[PDB]
């Protein structure tokens, strides 16, 4: 009966463009009185949410005239003009006409648009005064890869889950890139048991870029 | 939570923008300009505002001759007349 | 009722008001401005729109000779240094000098003293009302701006003990506000009538200063324009000290022979408007400016020297202002003034500014009106923008001239010029920019017009007028050559726009005819002036009251009415309204009588005829009077007086059919 | 013009209670619901609950996951809303913002920090990584924010990537700070403030 | 961006002298000298200039096109024109 | 453009049935509440009626004096307000206004005249008023049932101090206005004009 | 059950600005801070317009020279330019409470003058309705300002009596009454004077006019 909301998780923008976000609610949201009970937040990175869009299409004052909202009964639309480099950050389309609201979902991220670039995938080992520390954390990271969401795994012989834990930077100012690193750690003992690759796929890669961690 | 009171805040932001939005209707219609500063150097010797409120406060009347450092043929230009060719009818006026 | 739904209604009301308060806004900064009308004469024969239309898309290269009529010692002021110039050619209007002083009321007296420039800007305004559809007569006491760009070229020469012919009208003669404030004096607009003197860039701001003007509500309509003219050629001496004209005068734009800039005459002028103010009135739109912008350099090499920086800026403040992305346009009317300094620096800021994310397979069209027709000077904006709504019209850029090869001082490698014609999902959309040398530099984006029957009426007069038959004569000859080339108009349309969209003038002639075969020898008639079956001529009297007549018997004979009848609703209804009244003094009905029904009596009979040739006089009577014809007075013969005393309205229709009847009947 | 500032947020051990204040000027207070909503460092943002106003009787909700420890008060006559946390969870770490309307969140407050965990202060681990070329070091095992890597005492700043820090399941907190150069010495220095530890570590082959 | 709107008239004074008669140098000067970026026009509309451009002035405050402008106009006589023709 | 045409009125003798229709045009009319507003002549409005929209349930409600007697409905798919009149009683008539929003009336029709009694249609009979004995002088409309009735004083000729009065009606349900002329202390005639009785009485005024 | 007064009339001049305020018997304001009051003008034949809802939010294309003002029980539309476009009778009507059975007595807004007294005239019964079988007599007033003089028959019969108000003039902006008093034959043959007093604020004195034929 609760009514869920679903909008695209990523939509890659340019300083110009007009992009356009999108949101389909599992019930009619359009009230008896007429209205369409939706609202549009927007997160910038590293600053509070503030309010864009309220019942559907009316614009909040103060907002930039470039947004507008749009659509009826289940189907709504988030419209800008003219994309800004400050208009990037997180989008909350989120409904109102059934209450409590738990969560504001997923949201929508928005990042600028550029080239697809591979990443340049490295692996390190674990250092020795590391070992002796009694730990080991065996360390790869991708560079310099667009865009986000690269997925990587850790083939600790011939699988791994639960004891990885990933990072990923803003966009950088010039390159607008990411860059991924994750860090498995289980033991000093259990490390040397055996031989640790790294596998990574994303878009970018036609194949699953593997670095093997033979020595160990 | 019902609907008496989810409307009231749509209201509330909703009237709020429509004062914001005459606002500025209002504020790129018939906005107040201020003047910040001021400059003049008008006939009687007036190089200021104050020194132009001087003059007007004082009543004084900068009408004067001719300039004499402009090769103006001044002496062959009076002509009382006001009908002759080339020629003035006014011997005086405020030059700076 | 319960609470939600009586805040709903509060809410309701609240953001209708919200919207509607957002829409006055936009509207009253981001106003989308009408080109309802244009005029334009500019050097090689152009004396319309038309005219540069197919100057500029022939290719035509409209340099020619320097005058000889102007008084100028053209054999001896020419030498390929101390006071002398190496250009022999330049764009010129040799008819600057041709002006109708009669017309406007100007006296020879003040139009020799009066500034060609003035001259020339007074028919421009006019021709340019006219080709929007208005009559300037019509527009006396409307909220009309004038907004000129001009500048004092000196025509009476104020340094230079003003002669003796052009003595006291050389203030209101050359003043250069006066430019401006003439066309409102003439045409009796009372909008605000402001000169701007902004050297090269003084039309595109007036433009601009009319968009704003007209956005505030200031205004209704607007005249932007410009206007340059060269009584003296000081311009090519002054300019050629430096070389910065080129050597044999043509403005090389953009092209790697680019080696000076001529400088050229012409006068050229728009009519504009609201879009919506031109939509509710039903004005025909030939291009819609979106946007503008104005600025300045400030820190310029020199102050007589461009800037990217700036053009860059004020190309991107015009392409916000209009709310448009740079890959919205695909045209640059460029000012490509032709010198060696300045083209680089305008292909570098459109470069920077336009094309930076086009697609890679629509470049931005780089062109210019100069390589034609050489710098207008004030009026090369307005010129432009002309040109690039022809463009936009005719659906085809045309070429630039006299680019050999592209520059080699900017990296083309976006951006191309217009070296041949090439043709045109969305609106088309033009940039048109008009930097100028005081550092003052303007844009403007003009966009494509949006896209916008009755029954024909039979016998649609075609009327003409003019202040002279010579002039009357003149307008037929140009409505026949008009009409030659034209695929079957429309006969009623032809007949509305000539009563309606024309001043009705002193000398005036009318064609009416029902086949479409007379009418062109109709008017060729009036040409030369020989007579005519379906012509008529005659002088309009200034002043004079109207007079109804209606005489006794005499004029009845069989039929009268009858085609009237199904053709005329109106006598239709009189003679319907004047049947009932009579019915009751009398034992026939009107219609049987005059359609010539079977039985009815014929006119042979006292009794019948003199009803008849009442109702007939009545209804033909109020037919006058529906067409707008209400007499000052009115006059009978016999009978006919007692129709008479019912237009009068002393007597009513029963009462005037009671008196024609009994007393036909005794 | 509308303003809210929040104070009152920073570390505190579980189990333990807090107050965030939120301060509101610029308009009449007493008329606007106040919500509090949580996002926490990686999850979007939830809603704690929030409270109506006086005329509506000042009623407070609560989310499910927060009913009973948590609560909301407000008093109009200096305008201040206050959300009082009782026996906080290690999972309440999050920032919390203050937002005038109870449905409609048409303000937001600047946004509080607040961390629950048991973890003391402790200086980092700092450990090199062995090498077109990709080389960094590791700082490990350390609690508390912030700490600043700087290559070559700020030197080396092209292509410079220090990611942002990670829950280890000890409760300490680690990252690293990596850069790629060509194939031909090198040393970052990690200053941590709140230990006032500043260990250079040189990274080679 | 600081406006220069100056109501001046062409006055009959006569690299340098081209540049030194046009009353669009009257404003643009002022633009060049003190590194104004706002848009500078010298707006001849006769005995009202100054003022007229005070209003244009004030238009280009009102729609944010410059946020100072410079409204104001001069009048020099170097010859008796408008004393012997008037 | 948000509009709203009436239409529906005329002449009605009482205790019978009648329709007003309400056309709108230029807005959602499903959405909004539509409310029906009389008002009698010379007196302040009177709110007879409204219905809710057909998303809230579409049901209706009446003014106290009009239970049962009146009833709303409307057609959506035309977008039309139906105020059906059963049994009208004499003093019902008045200007019935059609209006938008039940509580909040943003926008108003032009208004029909509905007009209810059980007179018909007579032709006016006019009195004379001698002048006293500044000076003033009259003629009195009477028994007259429809309107409107037009009078002229010397056929229109004179036009300063006429102060023609609202018509007012008798408890017999007939109509009786009066002209009057505040002449300056020649020949005084008023002519009374009755189109619906086709009359054009005319008449001196003298001592 | 909440009530709500204003003036009954408040003259006005185009000139100077008018503020109308009227009282309400209860706090119309709400508990979501409202004041569930509205303004509405009727014009001279022309039907009523919104002018103002809850308090002081102002309806879009409503000039902006009127401005709704107050609070709790207070209320007042204040106007800055009086204009004769703007006269008629101007509602303060409550919402809070519903349904609404009437808008109320209204305020009228009329141009304002300077006094002046009005001119009594008592016209006879003519001869001829008399033989028709009724008899009627017709007190008029003229050139008065402001309305709301009173005017009573004294024979003092109080339930034959109809009067009719001219409206305010467009040249002068004077306002006018008759007022007719029916009486029957036997009726009309019983009383030989009959005397109509008229009070106005303009009169120093009520100065009747008598009649004495029966």
């Not at chain 1, 910038?44 to 005239?65: E, F, H, M, T």
């Not at chain 2, 008496?4 to 209201?11: I, P, W």
């Not at chain 3, 030498?79 to 000098?97: H, I, M, N, R, W």
Request: glycine share 10%.
């Amino acid at each position: 009966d609760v009514v869920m909301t679903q909008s695209p998780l990523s939509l890659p923008v340019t300083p110009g463009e007009p992009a356009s976000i999108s949101c389909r609610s599992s019930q009619s949201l359009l009230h008896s009185n007429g209205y369409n009970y939706l609202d549009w937040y927007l997160q910038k990175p590293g600053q509070s949410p503030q309010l864009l869009i309220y019942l559907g299409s009316n614009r909040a004052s103060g907002v930039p005239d470039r947004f507008s909202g749009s659509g009826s009964g289940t189907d709504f639309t988030l419209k800008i003009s003219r994309v800004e480099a400050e208009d990037v950050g997180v989008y909350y389309c989120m409904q109102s006409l059934q209450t409590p609201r738990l969560t504001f979902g997923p949201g929508t991220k928005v990042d600028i648009k550029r080239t697809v670039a591979a990443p340049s995938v490295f692996i390190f080992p674990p250092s020795d005064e590391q070992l002796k520390s009694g730990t080991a954390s065996v360390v790869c990271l991708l560079n310099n890869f667009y865009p986000r969401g690269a997925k990587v795994q850790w083939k600790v012989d011939n699988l791994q889950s639960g004891n990885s834990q990933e990072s990923v930077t803003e966009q950088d100012s010039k390159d607008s890139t990411y860059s991924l690193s994750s860090t498995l750690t289980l033991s000093k003992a259990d490390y040397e048991k055996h031989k640790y690759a790294c596998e990574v796929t994303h878009q970018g890669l036609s194949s699953p870029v593997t670095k093997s961690f033979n020595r160990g | 939570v019902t609907d008496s009171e989810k409307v009231a805040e749509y209201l509330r932001r909703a009237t709020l923008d429509l004062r914001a939005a005459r606002q500025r209707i209002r504020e790129l219609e018939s906005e107040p300009i201020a003047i910040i500063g001021m400059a003049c150097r008008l006939p009687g010797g007036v190089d200021s505002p104050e020194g132009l409120w001087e003059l007007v406060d004082s009543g004084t009347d900068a009408i004067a001759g001719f300039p004499l450092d402009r090769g103006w043929d001044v002496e062959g230009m009076y002509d009382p007349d006001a009908e002759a060719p080339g020629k003035t009818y006014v011997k005086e006026a405020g030059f700076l | 009722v319960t609470d939600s739904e009586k805040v709903a209604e509060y809410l309701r009301r609240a953001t209708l008001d919200l919207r509607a308060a957002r829409q006055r806004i936009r509207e009253l900064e981001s106003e989308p401005i009408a080109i309802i009308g244009m005029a334009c004469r500019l050097p090689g024969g152009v004396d319309s729109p038309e005219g540069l239309w197919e100057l500029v898309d022939s290719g035509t290269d409209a340099i020619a000779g320097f005058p000889l009529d102007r008084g100028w010692d053209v054999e001896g002021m020419y030498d390929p240094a101390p006071g002398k110039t190496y250009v022999k050619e330049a764009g010129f209007l040799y008819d600057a000098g041709e002006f109708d002083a009669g017309f406007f009321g100007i006296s020879p007296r003040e139009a020799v003293s009066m500034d060609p420039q003035q001259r020339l800007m007074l028919e421009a305004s006019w021709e340019a009302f006219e080709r929007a559809g208005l009559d300037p007569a019509r527009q006396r006491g409307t909220a009309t701006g004038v907004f000129v760009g001009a500048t004092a070229t000196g025509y009476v020469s104020p340094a230079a003990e003003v002669p003796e012919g052009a003595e006291g009208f050389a203030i209101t003669g050359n003043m250069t506000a006066v430019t401006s404030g003439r066309i409102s004096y003439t045409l009796g607009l009372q909008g605000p009538a402001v000169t701007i003197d902004t050297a090269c860039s003084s039309s595109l701001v007036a433009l601009h200063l009319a968009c704003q003007s007209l956005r505030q509500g200031e205004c209704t309509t607007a005249l932007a324009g410009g206007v340059t003219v060269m009584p003296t050629p000081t311009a090519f001496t002054e300019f050629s000290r430096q070389r910065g004209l080129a050597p044999d005068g043509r403005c090389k734009s953009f092209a790697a022979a680019a080696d000076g800039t001529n400088w050229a005459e012409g006068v050229a002028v728009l009519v504009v408007e609201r879009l919506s103010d031109a939509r509710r009135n039903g004005h025909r739109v030939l291009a819609v400016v979106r946007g503008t912008a104005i600025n300045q350099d400030g820190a310029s090499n020199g102050l007589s020297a461009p800037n990217d920086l700036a053009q860059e800026r004020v190309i991107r403040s015009a392409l916000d202002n209009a709310g448009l992305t740079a890959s919205d346009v695909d045209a640059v009317e460029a000012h490509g003034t032709g010198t060696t300094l300045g083209d680089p620096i305008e292909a570098q800021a459109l470069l920077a500014a336009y094309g930076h994310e086009r697609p890679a397979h629509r470049p931005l069209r780089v062109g210019s009106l100069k390589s034609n027709i050489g710098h207008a000077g004030p009026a090369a904006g307005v010129a432009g923008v002309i040109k690039m709504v022809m463009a936009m019209r005719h659906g085809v850029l045309p070429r630039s001239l006299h680019i050999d090869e592209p520059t080699p001082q900017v990296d083309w490698s976006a951006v191309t010029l217009l070296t041949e014609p090439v043709d045109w999902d969305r609106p088309r959309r033009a940039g048109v920019s008009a930097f100028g040398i005081s550092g003052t530099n303007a844009h403007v984006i003009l966009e494509q017009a949006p896209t916008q029957p009755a029954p024909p009426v039979p016998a649609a007069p075609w009327l003409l007028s003019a202040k002279t038959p010579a002039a009357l004569r003149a307008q037929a000859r140009r409505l026949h050559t008009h009409l030659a080339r034209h695929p079957h108009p429309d006969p009623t349309d032809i007949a509305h726009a000539l009563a309606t969209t024309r001043t009705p003038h002193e000398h005036r002639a009318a064609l009416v005819t029902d086949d479409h075969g007379t009418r062109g020898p109709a008017l060729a008639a009036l040409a030369e002036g020989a007579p005519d079956a379906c012509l008529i001529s005659g002088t309009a009297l200034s002043k004079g009251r109207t007079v109804f007549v209606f005489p006794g018997q005499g004029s009845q004979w069989t039929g009268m009415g009858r085609e009237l009848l199904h053709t005329s609703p109106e006598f239709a209804a009189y003679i319907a309204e004047c049947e009932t009244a009579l019915n009751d003094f009398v034992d026939w009905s009107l219609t049987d009588v005059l359609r010539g029904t079977e039985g009815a009596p014929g006119y042979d009979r006292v009794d019948v005829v003199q009803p008849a040739l009442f109702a007939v006089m009545v209804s033909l009577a109020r037919l006058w009077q529906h067409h707008g014809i209400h007499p000052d007075a009115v006059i009978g013969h016999s009978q006919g007086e007692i129709a008479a005393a019912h237009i009068a309205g002393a007597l009513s229709l029963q009462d005037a059919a009671r008196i024609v009847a009994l007393r036909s009947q005794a | 013009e509308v303003q809210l500032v929040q104070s009152g947020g920073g570390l505190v051990q579980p189990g333990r209670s807090l107050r965030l204040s939120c301060t509101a000027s610029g308009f009449t207070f007493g008329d606007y619901a106040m919500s509090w909503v949580r996002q926490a460092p990686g999850k979007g943002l939830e809603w704690v609950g929030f409270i109506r106003s006086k005329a509506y009787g000042g009623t407070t909700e609560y989310a499910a996951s927060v009913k009973g420890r948590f609560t909301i008060s407000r008093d109009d006559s200096k305008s201040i809303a206050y959300l009082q946390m009782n026996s906080l969870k290690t999972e309440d770490t999050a920032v919390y913002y203050c937002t005038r309307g109870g449905t409609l969140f048409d303000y937001w407050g600047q946004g509080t920090l607040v961390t629950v965990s048991s973890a003391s202060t402790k200086g980092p681990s700092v450990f090199p990584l062995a090498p077109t070329a990709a080389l960094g070091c590791l700082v490990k095992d350390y609690f508390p924010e912030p700490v600043t890597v700087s290559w070559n005492s700020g030197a080396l700043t092209s292509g410079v990537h220090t990611f942002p820090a990670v829950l280890q399941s000890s409760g300490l907190y680690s990252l690293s700070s990596v850069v790629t150069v060509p194939s031909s010495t090198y040393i970052c220095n990690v200053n941590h403030k709140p230990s006032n530890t500043k260990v250079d570590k040189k990274v080679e082959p």
